[PDB]
Amino acid sequence: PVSMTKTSVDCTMYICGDSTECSNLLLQYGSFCTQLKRALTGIAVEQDKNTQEVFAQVKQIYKTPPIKYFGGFNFSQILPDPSKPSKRSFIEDLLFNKVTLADAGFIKQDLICAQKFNGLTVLPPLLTDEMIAQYTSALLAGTITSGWTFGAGAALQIPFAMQMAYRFNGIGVTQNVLYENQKLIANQFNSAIGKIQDSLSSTASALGKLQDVVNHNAQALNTLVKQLSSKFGAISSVLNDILSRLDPPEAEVQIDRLITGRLQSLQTYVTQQLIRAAEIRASANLAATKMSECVLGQSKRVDFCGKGYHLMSFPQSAPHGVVFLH
């Protein structure tokens, strides 16, 4: 996973609502609201920074030639599918269907209604899915049609079989081994890709680390919303009743407790969000390093780009994250 959800909060609308006495009393508590806003804005911008730094490794948008023959290797299940409007691949479509979101913060002309009516909203990402699909397709086309030369300069073409000979020679096995066993290697690769497709399509349920982010964010928002039903030692949990039954001198005393409780809830929520964003940033940095060192080149680091002697890697996108095929 690379990024998480972007949220914003209206502090006055959450704590007080449409009441004016509550807002006047809240005016005397300093500048907590501004600090909360600044923290959440920082998180929101950091998410876009993560996505951009992960998926923007390519200088130019490369294309694949009209004829698809790469020495017997198929590559059909990972290249873009022109039929679909989004121009995703088969595997990308399976991944998109596997993970279900809640909302991307589009027009909102249940639980989401309660969140909205109390000043909690979600903002959309800066890059749409189509742009990320274009980035992934450009990376894949460059890797297939130019080798590793497009990551250290300008893309230089080379037939795929000779590229595989290079990569074989790079792990201490002579290239005449590949040149004499081309069909067997192609068949094994095609079978492995088909097996991955079949496993993923037959309810693999392997995308849990990407559902956990969505579930945690939704649970945090639901807890924050449900926190409004407490009393914190006051007579009631509704400001209108307090204003109706008590004079202002006592109404202020009763309202201070509610203000303090709501502020404490908001502060704990924001602190937890910061702590989670830290680890999401660390994971995004790891993903960027893997993208730069596994797909743009061949690595001798043990068990870094898969188990065994590394040969190649291909990227795919998924909701809020990336997938590598080593």
Ligand X SMILES: *[C@@H]1O[C@H](CO)[C@@H](O)[C@H](O)[C@H]1NC(C)=O
- Residue 74 engages ligand X in binding (rule: CB under 6 A): yes
Determine phi and psi for 44, rounding to 5 degrees. Answer: -60, -45
Q: Which does 223 bind (CB under 5 to 8 A by kind): ligand X, another protein, none?
A: none
- Residue 187 engages ligand X in binding (rule: CB under 6 A): no
Q: Strand 321-325 relative to strand 314-318: parallel, antiparallel, unpaired?
A: antiparallel
Q: Which does 248 bind (CB under 5 to 8 A by kind): ligand X, another protein, none?
A: none
Cα separation of 269 and 11, whole Å? 12
Q: Which does 21 bind (CB under 5 to 8 A by kind): another protein, ligand X, none?
A: none
Q: Which does 125 bind (CB under 5 to 8 A by kind): another protein, ligand X, none?
A: another protein
Pick one of 158, 196, 238, 325: the residue that binds another protein (CB under 8 A). Answer: 158
The stretch among 66-74, 113-121, 169-177, 230-238 that binds ligand X (CB under 6 A) is 66-74
H or E, element range at 321: strand 321-325
Q: Which residue has the tokens 């990376």?
A: 139
Residue number with CB closer to another protein (142 or 319): 142
The stretch among 148-156, 186-194, 210-218, 238-246 that binds another protein (CB under 8 A) is 148-156
Determine phi and psi for 123, rounding to 5 degrees. Answer: -105, 150
Pick one of 111, 278, 286, 302: the residue that binds another protein (CB under 8 A). Answer: 278
x/- mask, another protein, residues 46-65, rule CB under 8 A, reads --x---------xxxxxxxx
- Identify the CA nearest to 166 among candidates 179, 156, 154: 179
Instruction: Answer yes or no: are the C-beta atoms of 188 and 194 closer than 8 Å.
Output: no
Contacts of ligand X in 193-252 (CB under 6 A): 194
Longest dimension (CA), the chain: 94
- Residue 64 engages ligand X in binding (rule: CB under 6 A): no
Residue number with CB closer to another protein (255 or 318): 255
With b meaning 16 or more CB within 10 Å and e meaning fewer, what string describes 214-253?
Answer: beebbebbeebbebbeeeeebeeeebeebbeebeeeebee
Cβ atoms within 10 Å of 97's Cβ, excluding its own = 10
- Residue 275 engages ligand X in binding (rule: CB under 6 A): no
Residue number with CB closer to ligand X (74 or 237): 74
DSSP state of 310: -
Give residue 19's region: left, alpha or beta (phi > 0; psi -120 to 50). beta
What tokens were used for 166?
A: 């290079």
Cα separation of 161 and 131, whole Å? 31
Pick one of 271, 272, 286, 308: the residue that binds another protein (CB under 8 A). Answer: 271
Q: Strand 6-9 relative to strand 314-318: parallel, antiparallel, unpaired?
A: unpaired
Determine phi and psi for 261, rounding to 5 degrees. Answer: -65, -45
Pick one of 18, 69, 205, 303: the residue that binds ligand X (CB under 6 A). Answer: 69
Residue number with CB closer to ligand X (35 or 76): 76
- Residue 154 engages ligand X in binding (rule: CB under 6 A): no
- Residue 236 engages another protein in binding (rule: CB under 8 A): no
Q: How far is the CB of 67 from ligand X (least distance, A)?
A: 5
Contacting positions for ligand X (CB under 6 A): 67, 69, 74, 76, 194
Name the site residues for another protein (rule: CB under 8 A).
Answer: 25, 28-31, 35, 48, 58-65, 69, 106-107, 123-128, 131, 134-135, 138, 141-142, 145-146, 148-149, 151-159, 161-162, 165, 174-176, 179-180, 182, 252, 256, 267, 271, 274-275, 278, 282, 292-293, 296-297, 299-300
